[PDB]
Write a protein that binds this DNA or RNA. Structure first.
Ligand SMILES: [K+]
Ligand SMILES: [K+]
Ligand SMILES: [K+]
Ligand SMILES: [Mg+2]
Ligand SMILES: [Mg+2]
Ligand SMILES: [Mg+2]
Ligand SMILES: [Mg+2]
Ligand SMILES: [Mg+2]
Ligand SMILES: [Mg+2]
Ligand SMILES: [Mg+2]
Ligand SMILES: [Mg+2]
Ligand SMILES: [Mg+2]
Ligand SMILES: [Mg+2]
Ligand SMILES: [Mg+2]
Ligand SMILES: [Mg+2]
Ligand SMILES: [Mg+2]
Ligand SMILES: [Mg+2]
Ligand SMILES: [Mg+2]
Ligand SMILES: [Mg+2]
Ligand SMILES: [Mg+2]
Ligand SMILES: [Mg+2]
Ligand SMILES: [Mg+2]
Ligand SMILES: [Mg+2]
Lengths: 243, 54, 254
RNA sequence: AUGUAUUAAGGAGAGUAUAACUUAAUUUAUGUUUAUGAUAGAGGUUAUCAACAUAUGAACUCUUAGAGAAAUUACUUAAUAAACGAAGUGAAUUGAAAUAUCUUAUUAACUUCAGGAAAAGAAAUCAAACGAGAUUCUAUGAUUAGUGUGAACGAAAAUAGAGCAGCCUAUUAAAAUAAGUAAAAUGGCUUUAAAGCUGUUUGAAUAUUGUGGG
RNA sequence: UAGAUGUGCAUAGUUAAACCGAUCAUUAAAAUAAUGAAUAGUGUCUAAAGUUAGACCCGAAGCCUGGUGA
RNA sequence: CAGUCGCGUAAGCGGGGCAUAGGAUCACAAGAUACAAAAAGGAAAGAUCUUGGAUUUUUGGAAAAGCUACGCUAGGGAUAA
């Protein structure tokens, strides 16, 4: 009658409860499904125990190692970037930066060591955009530039991305200048903000520098190279000829 | 500061941790330019990076 | 239709003065007994205290000495006096203070909230009145009570009588189930009236209402503002990208 | 059982209006409100027919001067439990299907010292090329990095919450900025090989104008 | 008023691993030459479970530490 | 299938022996791979491939001698007088 005396869950939601050792006609009495007087009835068997036979992890050993230094990149495909621009969830008229990529829901809700653009759906991508990520595939770079757009790969960290979304750091696709001829214009730009902003870090390791220093990745340090210089900090392009 | 009578350096009256707290507290109130020289000042940290670099 | 009307009456005379419009997904949802169940059982779990405690054989007082020799006595071998087989032993699987609370997604709890309002709306058990919802006690009694002329005994005996004959005339008293008044803030007359005469109904503040409270009495008498605030805080499954939330169709004839 | 608040030495013996508590064992006073209280009588043993608040007399013996067979002696205005804290010392049952390394375990326990709490504490700290900013408690991070033949053991950064406080002129009275010290070899502890603790034998430097530690 | 904020899982696979990437790995150069691996998750409730804790219940002989007793 | 060598006029054969009787991981040692490199440049210590030394003979792989009639506990009558 009363609504509160008529509520229930769906019948399929309810499952039988098994109370063991409560009589013979229950089907689980006097042994509770254990058997007759074995180790499995008196006590407990270790889970890693196989009776004494050596496990395969010992007879064969553990293979390989786990890379604790590899960066965890958020993978973004052109197939998905196009689906967002058409739906109106990403503005193609403005620069597409990690802040706009994270706040769009296109890579999810988890921030990781970086964002990499991949080339799934490169045949149907024909929207001119100005995107900036940490890495990009050789297929995505051509698809973005073939449609009349621009792409730049910049160095980021898991902490830098958080500050970008939080608004504590302003985005910039250029490295910090070096020299006494830029200290003034850079200090003035900071005073004009009237708010404490954290700088975006630049690469420090050999690999990270070489990555953003070559034009194949459209790295934001590639402008520091000469037309004949190599991105590597150690290797050089040898010379051809008879000498 | 090096004590004149005893040739021993005296630790600064404010540790590098307490120096950064004043700079942070003085920056949130607009009196950072009233503090003496400090390697924790936001302009000095930035100037040393732009001038010299990595 | 995507929207449903909501009439706003003047509580004393119940004169329909204004007309608002809400979404069908607010006050016209289907009756889901399984979703209302999960919400009602979810609130009871959180209300439970869960402090019962019993002692095990590892907490019962006494020494852990061996009672009888292992053999030679002709009796059954025994270990400690705190065994469950012994007189004052410890209950093996007895109650312990734990958390009986369960989880329920904010979107399911918000659907169960609007489903309870829709159950009352489609049945005519949801009466929306204008703000200022309080029992119109006589001015003479109100003047005496403040003055201090009336004793506590007589002051409470009058409120119990007036509230009774008042609810019985409106067919809102114990005979017709009961009524639950929901207001945004506490009101002296309303709350004091049903604190002394609770058989005729009860009054609650919007912050104290539960899904179960929207299904106990015979009617829900809620204020225009409390309803709008009640639905605005329990539509997580709707405003995610809005719908009509208090759209005034007919304004009060000032 | 949990939470909140307050407090920070505990017991015994014998005696006594058998609700009344210390040989005074039911002391003597003050103020206010007293049925609209508080939350126009009878009644001093045929008693305490008054609650709140503020004062006040009395309050024995032992633990507890010395001594002794505690509650005695002999003297005298003799007087401080437990638990919790820190350091020192430090197992075994147990698990590994035996068992030594390991685990159990910087555990239990014991000793010393200390207070109502104690301890710790304002970076010779962490981070990583951006920055954070003492200590303490809880959760996540984390059946992770890592160690170990195994069984198993096991962080930190960071995050969230509880609290938040900085200083040396320390709100209680301290430094002329630290040499047998840092560090090394060796024997151990801890541990990831670093850092940290340490017996023995040796043994530095002077500040970002780049001195010292990490 | 506005802004930011708060574990996690999934969204792309591949390899010992990174680079790489709808492709990746082996081929000491590479190359459809060959072989393997590609498409709905997430939260809650009910119930049954694995793991660690006393772990379904009762039961040793013994080992260690501190105390007691001539 | 790729690589590149031998024999053969050629077709073709060849990834030891007419067939059936030689144990891993771990650690260690020697070569290659260019993977990662705990601030950074290096390195150390690791990872992958090839290879070597075993009555690991209780040979799916513990570094291991006895007495008890002074004996004890849990069990078996699943094996005795
Ligand atoms: K015992
Ligand atoms: K060092
Ligand atoms: K992946
Ligand atoms: Mg089933
Ligand atoms: Mg059966
Ligand atoms: Mg079974
Ligand atoms: Mg079963
Ligand atoms: Mg049986
Ligand atoms: Mg069995
Ligand atoms: Mg009991
Ligand atoms: Mg339940
Ligand atoms: Mg004495
Ligand atoms: Mg005495
Ligand atoms: Mg073993
Ligand atoms: Mg590990
Ligand atoms: Mg010093
Ligand atoms: Mg030292
Ligand atoms: Mg060391
Ligand atoms: Mg040191
Ligand atoms: Mg390095
Ligand atoms: Mg064998
Ligand atoms: Mg075999
Ligand atoms: Mg004999």
């Amino acid at each position: 009658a009363s609504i509160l005396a008529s509520l229930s869950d769906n019948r399929g939601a309810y499952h039988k409860r098994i109370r063991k050792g409560r009589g013979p006609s229950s089907g689980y009495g006097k042994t509770a499904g254990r058997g007759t007087k074995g180790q499995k009835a008196h006590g407990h068997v270790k889970p890693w125990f196989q009776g004494g036979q050596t496990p395969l992890i010992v007879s064969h050993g553990r293979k390989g190692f786990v890379n604790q230094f590899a960066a965890d990149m958020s993978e973004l495909n052109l197939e998905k970037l196009q689906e967002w621009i058409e739906a109106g969830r990403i503005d193609p008229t403005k620069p597409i930066t990690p802040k706009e990529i994270i706040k769009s829901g296109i890579i999810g809700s988890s921030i990781k060591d970086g964002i990499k653009l991949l080339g799934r759906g490169k045949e149907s991508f024909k929207i001119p955009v100005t995107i900036t990520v940490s890495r990009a595939s050789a297929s995505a770079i051509e698809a973005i530039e073939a449609a009349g757009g621009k792409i730049v790969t910049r160095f980021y960290t898991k902490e830098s991305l958080k500050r970008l979304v939080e608004g504590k750091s302003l985005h910039t696709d250029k490295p910090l200048p070096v020299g006494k001829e830029h200290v003034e214009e850079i200090l003035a730009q900071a005073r004009s903000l009237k708010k404490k902003y954290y700088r975006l870090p630049d690469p420090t390791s050999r690999w990270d520098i070489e990555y953003y220093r070559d034009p194949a990745h459209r790295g934001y340090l590639s402008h520091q190279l000469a037309p004949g210089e190599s991105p590597s900090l150690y290797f050089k392009v040898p010379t051809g000829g008879e000498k | 500061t090096k004590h004149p009578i005893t040739g021993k350096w005296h630790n600064p009256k404010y540790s590098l941790r307490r120096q950064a707290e004043l700079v942070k507290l003085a920056q949130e109130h607009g009196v950072e330019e009233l503090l003496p020289f400090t390697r924790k000042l936001n302009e000095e940290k930035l100037r040393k990076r732009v001038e010299l670099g990595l | 239709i995507t929207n449903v009307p909501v009439t706003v009456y003047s509580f004393p005379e119940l004169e329909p003065r204004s007309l608002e419009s809400y979404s069908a997904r607010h006050l016209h949802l289907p009756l889901r007994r399984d979703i209302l169940h999960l919400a009602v059982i979810y609130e009871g779990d959180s209300t439970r205290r869960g402090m019962a405690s019993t002692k095990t054989r590892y907490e019962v007082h006494g020494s852990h000495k061996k009672m009888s020799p292992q053999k030679g006595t002709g009796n059954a071998r025994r270990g400690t006096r705190q065994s469950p087989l012994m007189k004052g032993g410890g209950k093996t699987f007895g109650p312990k203070p734990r958390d009986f609370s369960t989880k329920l997604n904010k979107k399911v709890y918000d659907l169960a909230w609007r489903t309870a309002l829709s159950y009352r709306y489609k049945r005519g058990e949801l009466i929306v009145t204008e703000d200022g919802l309080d029992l119109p006690l006589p001015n003479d009694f109100l003047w005496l009570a403040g003055g201090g002329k009336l004793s506590r005994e007589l002051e409470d005996g009058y409120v119990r009588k007036w509230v009774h004959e008042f609810m019985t005339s409106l067919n809102w008293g114990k005979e017709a189930g009961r009524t639950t008044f929901i207001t945004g803030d506490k009101r002296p007359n309303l709350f004091t009236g049903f604190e002394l005469a609770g058989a005729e109904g009860r009054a609650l503040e919007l912050w104290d209402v539960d899904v179960k409270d929207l299904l106990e009495t015979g009617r829900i008498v809620i204020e225009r503002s409390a309803l709008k605030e009640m639905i605005e805080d329990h539509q997580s499954d709707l405003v995610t990208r809005g719908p009509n939330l208090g759209e005034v169709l007919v304004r009060a004839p000032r």
